[PDB]
Ligand binder design. Structure first.
Ligand SMILES: O=N[O-]
Ligand SMILES: O=N[O-]
Ligand SMILES: O=N[O-]
Ligand SMILES: [Cu+2]
Ligand SMILES: [Cu+2]
Ligand SMILES: [Cu+2]
Ligand SMILES: [Cu+2]
Ligand SMILES: [Cu+2]
Ligand SMILES: [Cu+2]
Lengths: 333, 333, 333
């Protein structure tokens, strides 16, 4: 049966960008092949130079977004090079059995493996490393990403009518727990292993020291802001592998939102803010109607503005005064 | 086009009360005019006299509830008197563009401005102050409220049938982060500015010192309890601009609930408790069936009973033994 | 009217098991009689011997699951033996009036009472002790459980078609706040009363020291894992009386999920993880398709793996390679 299926190899792209794919499937079920390389690396997460030993899928935090269609087979080649120091694996929330694949993918530095699973349910799902006994430690070190399983006929609105996006972005939100000295200064370590004992005590406080988009404070800002034009339909996938978040587009809305990200359910309309539970990926669809800068944030504003959970959208186009206008500009009175 | 529209000025009322309005629109689209005055003031929040420098819209925490209909134009005159010390603005989650209006409404002490926006989506939304760089500080100092955009044909149930409330109340929930000394005593400051540096360090712990309804511990109790009679249909709007809450009416239910508050979606039925994400306003509709006192609470009971997130309903009427009865009153055995 | 109704006494079973009942009602409305005995007892909650003074309904944490049908009358005899030291009561979220029954059920050591209420709404609900002034203290000491009110025609899917489970399990999740000394060691007390003053200060930090299933770290593991076979339809009821949780079955899904647990609403499909708000009971229905061990967890992985919110499912049957297979087992390369 599988022997007879067509196969296509797909090369992944770095978040927030997403690899080329078709929304509506033009071919029948296939075996979609991906290759990921694990990379343990030092990463600077804020403006003051705080450094951590990130554990990554393909060198990025979050790991890249994989896109397939319902009933396709995902075939993953996972490589853990001998330059790493720890055992890693991968658990797909999109998959059925063997702890999401985690029990079949344990690779020590110098090993590789290939797992295949059938994508039987449509929706956006989280995938993350989950080694027996060090689970929260690898996840909160940035070792998580997401896979999107599209219905073969693409997205549909509350009424069964087609929804087609023009642009798609992947925002992976990460909660970090950096150990601190008595005064509150962040600690630095030589290897991932040296940090372990302190990492555990920092996580048990349940209070993140940083909560960021795309791996660092300000990663999605300035020259890195997400871009769009008035009139474009944008799909924004957002994942949080460990902790709850409440995304919100300032100056905009979630016209159609699957907060818990499963496409067999109808979307919620006109959301101001939506809750994505820790361990879940969600998707929001919006059509831009006004140009300018928009801030995309986790709506606990302390987590957004003090901790790092803020990004930008820079949108081009003509201003519409019907929707909004300054009748009297700020003046003395 | 707007030139030709009828206009009506509306005078706001203090929470938990709501200004007079029609559920079902009897007129066509209009320009609804509101005036809000910013007031920075000291506020005592608990029984022991803890004081803070509240930043308010119209002198209350939360700011008043505005009520309009879908496709009406909201025209707001915002005044920041010279007696204030800080720059303020306003971002409406109900609006499209310019950061919810925040980028068009920056007023220093002594200034005013008038913003107009079209209410294109029906639902209850949060509005809050959002000055560049001091966002969480103004919000958690009480500078937030809500606007309700009613469908022109009013509320409907899961089946499209009309829902008409007899009473409506606005409960604004506020998380406060009061700085503390080494022993745990709350600090006091001369001006809002003196508190700033400590405010920031208190917010980063992410642990509120108080979580209250209508600005203070016990504000909605005793002589201030919300009132109703058996048989009345009550709509309770609840907002949390920064943090998640889970409202619950003890001894009652949410017969129809829009947890994320957007009226184009059908309501959830028979809720015991519902989650309102930080940065969102929700609405619950209930018909009283038994008389007595009811406690309306945030269902994390520590936040409710230790931190201040508890209010009361005092309901008049006849007891129904079919629904409930004490078969054997507490006695020795 | 009630005089004329048939009556049936039901003997409760210890969680995670559930007493015998019919899914589809074969009789007309009845008066279902239950007896619960309060028991204050010392309980060891972790591997290192941490002990607490648990306050329980029937000797277990959580209290047992009660199962009735919509429009049946629940008649509860509640006994607080003279061996206890504190006043207790019971508030049913399933009931209408008198604070869920809390104001009608106050019993001091040596007393008993019998409350009757009509189960007018279908769904899974929480019940918990709620004495005026010590509410969070009795709840977080383990004094809560759940009642399931089944529609008279049983469960239905998103389309109105019947859903029949083969097995049902009750998982009660508990957040504990154990007082600590200066170094971080947990304190021990002689009586519940001696712990009170410190209990309050520990709860106000809002940071649980333990979060467990069925009363202890590892209670649902090893020889205590939940069991099933490939092909069985399992209903898992989960409750959290005080704090939010996000259940997730590793290697599986929630095929039909009522996150806020009210059966008049259609279920959400294909959930990876779902949010159950503090003060609520939810239910997830799943059909096992692969054999092996599954971990059932609260998906904030720090709360799961460091704090105790993890249990197991041991499923028998044949492996299906179509759904998943190890193409290349971990090897050197
Ligand atoms: O929409 N300003 O958080
Ligand atoms: O319903 N007592 O939290
Ligand atoms: O599905 N491993 O949390
Ligand atoms: Cu890893
Ligand atoms: Cu997981
Ligand atoms: Cu302000
Ligand atoms: Cu906002
Ligand atoms: Cu009790
Ligand atoms: Cu309760």
């Amino acid at each position: 049966d599988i022997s007879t299926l067509p196969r296509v190899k797909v090369d992944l792209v770095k978040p927030p960008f997403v690899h080329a794919h078709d929304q509506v499937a033009k071919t029948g079920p296939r075996v979609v092949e991906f290759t990921m390389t694990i990379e343990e690396k030092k990463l600077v997460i804020d403006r003051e130079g705080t450094e951590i030993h990130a554990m990554t899928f393909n060198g990025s935090v979050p790991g890249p977004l994989m896109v397939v269609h319902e009933n396709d087979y995902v075939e993953l080649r996972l490589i853990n090079p001998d330059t790493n120091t720890l055992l890693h694996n991968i658990d797909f929330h999109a998959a059925t059995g063997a702890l999401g694949g985690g029990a079949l993918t344990q690779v020590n530095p110098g090993e590789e493996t290939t797992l295949r699973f059938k994508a039987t349910k449509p929706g956006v799902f989280v995938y993350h490393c989950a080694p027996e006994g060090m689970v929260p430690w690898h996840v909160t070190s940035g070792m998580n990403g997401a896979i999107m399983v599209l219905p073969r006929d693409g997205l549909k609105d509350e009424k069964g009518q087609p929804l087609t996006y023009d642009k798609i972005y992947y925002v992976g939100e990460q909660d970090f727990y950096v150990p601190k000295d008595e005064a509150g200064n962040y600690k630095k370590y030589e290897t991932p292993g040296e940090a372990y004992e302190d990492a555990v005590k920092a996580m048990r406080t349940l209070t993140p020291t940083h909560i960021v988009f795309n791996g660092a404070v300000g990663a999605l800002t300035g020259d890195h802001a997400l871009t769009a034009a008035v009139g474009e339909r944008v799909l924004v996938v957002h994942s949080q592998a460990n902790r709850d978040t409440r995304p919100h587009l300032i100056g905009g809305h979630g016209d159609y939102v699957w907060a818990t990200g499963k496409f067999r359910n109808p979307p919620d309309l006109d959301q101001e803010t939506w809750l994505i539970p820790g361990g879940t990926a969600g998707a929001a669809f919006y059509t831009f109607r006004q140009p300018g800068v928009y801030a995309y944030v986790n709506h606990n504003l302390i987590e957004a503005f003090e901790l790092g959970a803020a990004g930008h959208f820079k949108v081009t186009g003509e201003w519409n005064d019907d929707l909004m206008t300054s009748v009297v500009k700020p003046a003395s009175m």
